[PDB]
Ligand binder design. Structure first.
Ligand SMILES: O=c1c(O)c(-c2ccc(O)c(O)c2)oc2cc(O)cc(O)c12
Length: 237
């Protein structure tokens, strides 16, 4: 992710077929002539999309120009959570299924995976960062405390940010409860709160494996609900 001079970011297209599929998704959702109510509502939960972008001298080098969802924050605390029971898509080969499940074999049970976090600490005026191996090490026994860490600043557990996150996720859940046209695999939620009350951003990202469907995205719904349940239990701390 590159931070373009505008309060925007540039996300470089992943290699094919993943990057092209993500481009296609953003193009479908943000089509100027789109009046599908489902897709118009979905726009609220994505970064705003400004189209494909390439450097002036490098039309080969493809990016998505996207809203910087952290722009309104001073000291943003950011967590990326992959959502769903399966991180492989409906056309994955046996090898690919195994590759994806082996990255985190608890995906079916938990329904989400923390990809990373960056937490501002007041006491030290510095960031603690957790990488991909952090969330991949979390089990049913440790997922609550693992998620809790995101909301620990210098002095307190940020239950305000926890409650706001639940409230924002519930709107996304409601969108999923009311559509049967898209299924999302290996997609994520980006959580942002202010680390420097109740002010949170939750946006859906990572759309290289979104497929047309005729069913409720049940794995995504499972994950959102379990994530809501974990966050809710954290409010009892
Ligand atoms: O707006 C975005 C953003 O700010 C970040 C970001 C910033 C700082 C971090 O430390 C981090 O992990 C992610 O990622 C993104 C990823 C997307 O796919 C789309 C986006 O719009 C953003």
């Amino acid at each position: 992710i590159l931070q373009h001079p505008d309060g925007t970011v540039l996300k470089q297209l992943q290699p094919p077929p993943r990057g092209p599929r993500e481009l296609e998704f953003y193009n479908m959702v943000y089509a100027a002539d789109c009046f599908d109510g489902v897709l118009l509502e979905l726009r609220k939960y994505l970064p705003k999309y400004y189209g494909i972008w390439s450097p002036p001298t490098a039309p080969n080098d493809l990016y998505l120009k996207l809203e910087d969802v952290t722009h309104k924050f001073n000291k943003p605390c950011i967590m990326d959570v992959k959502i769903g029971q399966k991180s492989y898509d409906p056309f994955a080969s046996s090898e690919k299924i195994q590759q994806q499940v082996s990255k985190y074999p608890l995906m079916e049970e938990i329904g989400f995976l923390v990809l990373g976090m960056r937490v501002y600490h007041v006491h030290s005026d510095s960031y603690e960062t957790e990488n991909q191996h952090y969330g991949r090490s979390l089990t049913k026994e440790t997922i609550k405390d693992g998620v809790s860490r995101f909301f620990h600043n210098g002095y307190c557990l940020r239950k305000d940010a926890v409650a706001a996150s639940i409230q924002k996720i519930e709107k996304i859940l409601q969108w999923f409860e009311n559509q049967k046209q898209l299924n999302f695999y290996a997609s994520s939620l980006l959580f942002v709160y202010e680390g420097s009350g109740g002010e949170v951003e939750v946006r859906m990202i990572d759309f290289a494996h979104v497929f047309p469907s005729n069913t409720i995205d049940e794995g995504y719904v499972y994950g959102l609900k379990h994530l809501i349940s974990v966050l809710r239990s954290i409010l009892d701390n």
